[PDB]
């Protein structure tokens, strides 16, 4: 069950990546950090991924799953199931960021 955790801002920029991403999508965390998740997305799935990130912030901590094609380091489209939820520390009024579990799954 090859999966990695990532953290993103509201725009989709990777702000944290777990080192298990090298085995999942082939990139080191430093190659994903500061970049937008839509840049590694298949052009047919980019709008669905943008709309998903916009809606996960309105869903009050609930889980939103999205399937999309991610361009691996080895230049291949991998099917990914990303489960996302917003987190906002309740002791604060900081902007809510998104936490993800990204797994390579079968489209079958």
């Amino acid at each position: 069950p090859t999966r990695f955790i990532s953290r993103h801002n509201i725009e989709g920029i990777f702000t944290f990546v777990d080192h298990r991403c090298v085995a999942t999508v082939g990139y080191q965390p430093q190659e994903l950090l500061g970049k937008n998740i839509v840049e590694f997305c298949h052009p047919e799935d980019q709008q669905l991924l943008r709309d998903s990130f916009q809606q996960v912030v309105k869903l009050k901590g609930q889980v939103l799953s999205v399937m999309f094609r991610f361009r691996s380091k080895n230049q291949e489209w991998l099917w990914m199931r990303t489960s996302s939820f917003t987190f906002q520390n309740p002791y604060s009024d900081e902007i809510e960021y998104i936490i993800c579990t990204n797994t390579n799954v079968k489209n079958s």
Partner: protein
Amino acid sequence: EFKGLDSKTFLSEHSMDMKFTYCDDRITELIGYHPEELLGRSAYEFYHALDSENMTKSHQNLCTKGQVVSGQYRMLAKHGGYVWLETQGTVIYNPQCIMCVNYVLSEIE
């Protein structure tokens, strides 16, 4: 000086039996542990005995509802003592694992 809210937050991943499957490197500055020594160890092994029943009830709520807020509990720190924490738990399905957002309520310098 004392740390901010973000610098006192760390993420963790767990299997349905509470064992650690991933831990943020941030836990080292806050509680002393290294993620590699926590892997395969149940989180229950670190709870303070007086928070035991409460954490059991919270884990049971997290399993039936899929998402929970733990409330205040203590976790045994590496070099002794206990830090107070508050976790937001979320189960990832399609049950696969539990994602935790852990915030250290204690004063950390």
